[PDB]
Design a protein around this nucleic acid. Sequence first.
DNA 1: CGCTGACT
DNA 2: ACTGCTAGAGATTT
DNA 3: AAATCTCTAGCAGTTACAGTCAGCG
DNA 4: CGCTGACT
DNA 5: ACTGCTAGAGATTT
DNA 6: AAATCTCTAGCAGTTACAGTCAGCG
Lengths: 172, 172, 251, 251
Amino acid sequence: CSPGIWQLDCTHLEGKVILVAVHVASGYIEAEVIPAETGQETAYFLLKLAGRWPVKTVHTDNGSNFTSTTVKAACWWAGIQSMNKELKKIIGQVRDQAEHLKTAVQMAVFIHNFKAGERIVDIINFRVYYRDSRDPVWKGPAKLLWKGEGAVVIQDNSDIKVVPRRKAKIIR
Amino acid sequence: CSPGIWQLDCTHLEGKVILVAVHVASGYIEAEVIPAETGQETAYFLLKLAGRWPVKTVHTDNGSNFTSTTVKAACWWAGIQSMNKELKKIIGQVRDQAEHLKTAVQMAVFIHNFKAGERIVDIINFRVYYRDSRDPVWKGPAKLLWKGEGAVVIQDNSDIKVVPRRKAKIIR
Amino acid sequence: FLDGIDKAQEEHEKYHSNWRAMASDFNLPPVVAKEIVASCDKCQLKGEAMHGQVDCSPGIWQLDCTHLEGKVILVAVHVASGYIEAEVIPAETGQETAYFLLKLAGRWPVKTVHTDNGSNFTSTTVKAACWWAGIKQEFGIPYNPQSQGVIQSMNKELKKIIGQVRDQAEHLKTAVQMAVFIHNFKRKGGIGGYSAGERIVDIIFRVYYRDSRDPVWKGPAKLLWKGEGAVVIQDNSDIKVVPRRKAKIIR
Amino acid sequence: FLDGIDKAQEEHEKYHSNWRAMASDFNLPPVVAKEIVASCDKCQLKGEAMHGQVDCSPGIWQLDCTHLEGKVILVAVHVASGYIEAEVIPAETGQETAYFLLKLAGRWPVKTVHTDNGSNFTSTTVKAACWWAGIKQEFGIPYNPQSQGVIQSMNKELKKIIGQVRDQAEHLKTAVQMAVFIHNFKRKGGIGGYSAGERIVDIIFRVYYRDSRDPVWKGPAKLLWKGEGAVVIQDNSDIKVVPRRKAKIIR
DNA sequence: CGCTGACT
DNA sequence: ACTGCTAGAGATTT
DNA sequence: AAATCTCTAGCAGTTACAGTCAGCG
DNA sequence: CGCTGACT
DNA sequence: ACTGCTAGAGATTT
DNA sequence: AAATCTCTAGCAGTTACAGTCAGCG
Ligand SMILES: [Mg+2]
Ligand SMILES: [Mg+2]
Ligand SMILES: [Zn+2]
Ligand SMILES: [Zn+2]
């Protein structure tokens, strides 16, 4: 399965439109209140996802807010049911926790996604970059010997060093 | 003779006061238009000379603009006839070269002093400080081998260098 | 001690000479000279001449607004990856920000937020939001924008990119998110030549001071705490933080 | 050449990617990448990232005004010795300045003056004055205060010293000349620990640019001359100087 | 409801 | 055809 | 202690006004 | 005399 | 009880 | 060419107004 696959959909909760994209190969969901059915806010949404995640393909239907040529232009520049009802039920749960609907929408997206994030992380030994005291230069690839909590044990070419986590970054 | 010796005097050309100090041991003269006879502009004048040259002693008379205690306070904080007539005659010469009198006063002081400056310089081998290109750090004592015009020939510990005069200073 | 000291203190208290002047002139050593200088109150203005280092942890997210074409942009940043979550705010208030942090928690793992003491970010609405989301609300010094420095630089580049692609839109918010696309996925460099999605996915006494835009350095105050970059002090039960560039310590 | 180049130019002309992005993405070398980047107009904003070095000759004297307590101070400086000739101006105009330069020529050997294109220093009165005194009137760039940089720093220290000794006067001009005394004779350091009287007596293509406080970098223009620090250019018979920090050259 | 001060 | 700098304050090495 | 790096504020023509909201009356 | 623009 | 930074542009050494 | 120092603008809540005078009408 491919990573750049997004399935689109929309519902009409409280008589208000909600537009949702779903990472198929992880089931990872982002749903946002669209004020009005049109290609404008749609292309705004795919433009957000475009710069929020690496889109390559959107799967969708013949709705007028999707066949709008603004979609094709913004996308040219740019290059599931059970989930809809999952978020529907969760929205039903936390509707009374927040007055505005859009709030509880993002609360349901939060609940589903974290309470799929580490799934997309799973879709896509270690090297460490660090800073000493009073020397804002970032330092070379440091061989991670151990990752601790609040401190980390690195090795450069001649010095096994302690560094607090507030001055380190660990990248493959 | 001592360097910090200044003789004071004043005249009244065009019915306007002019106050003059004279370096005795060089005859070096600074004369300035004082608007009014008082210790205020007087102490202003000795306060200028105090920060314009290293005064130690002023020789003067019992005039009221001099016995004013403002003089003694500003001075506490701070720590010839033929010249008066010399500048008088020169002022007579260049009076028609400038409308305002104060102007021609400073023109006469200019004429006398440069047309005594190098005398006070005479009252009080070489070391050179320099800057390279794109390195605003000032550099060490460089043994002057020759002083040229527009360039200078220096020696540091291992490099006899050319430097243009726009990037050099020569101090004993 | 030596009458040179007394006349050095009269000299100093009339002219506020430096330590080399009194030292060489009155034939004194540099230490007691620096003790006469350091005994003075007025001469002690300049600070320590050193920046710090912002905390660079995965769970941190900088946050700040800016201004353009009459509109108020809000900008969220990841400290490590340089990633962006930017959007337009129709009119700045705290509720819309709280909705934005809810938007940023529902997409990205947030643990704590480091921004300034602006109006919004102290409201109660934001507090309830980061409370619900398990996010810790951190603040910094008021008049030390460099404490947020990371995000500030982003605005520059963000505005820079808007200089390039403003002719590709009839509206602002579009070009904003376009710039976000460019910076996060299409530009590369820094760490190992990654774009911000690649990085973000790879990771996942007497103390004188001034404040208040007041160049009048403050009188002696009682040092409470010393860290690395800022300090905490007391001037008549006035407990306050100061960054070291804006402060001086007298041991 | 290679269709990768064409799609790199479409890519670039839609997103304005940098050279590493196009290079690594479309599997190209860095040189032609930097040629696509350098072929673009919009991306070419930033300049050369380097300061110069002001001419430090004995016969030079910096000159500039400043503002304090509603009054306008005038400040003359020697570049080498750090010496000062400061005074208050009752109300800034060119004639009073010309009288001041006459005052500074009658006390100190002047050969040439380096200041800015302010109103006064271009008037004819000053020209007649430095004409009579054998003094050469030099100017600098308008919107590059660092070209006078020396004198600017003096104002800081001068104002700093006025912070220390303003309670020793009923008038401003007094405290001004007091500060002059302190800085020139009583403070020491720098060269070898001298005060300014000791030192002063010891001595004695396609080029894009911006100006006019306009962050819109300018279109291609024809380089006329290259020195060390600034350059001279032509945009449709618009002969003008630009400092290198505010300019970029395309070979 | 003012409104203050506090930071932006 | 012209150009950033100065004075302190703190580490650090002799 | 005595020297020798290393680094930053503020100088540059200059500010009183806008925009919010927690907290106190 | 305006006044413009040009820099501070 | 907390902390300046980022992306280019140009020399310069491998 | 390919890497590796080295260094600076502008970001920070934000500007329309004052002060002069050479030059052009
Ligand atoms: Mg802010
Ligand atoms: Mg000026
Ligand atoms: Zn003092
Ligand atoms: Zn481009």
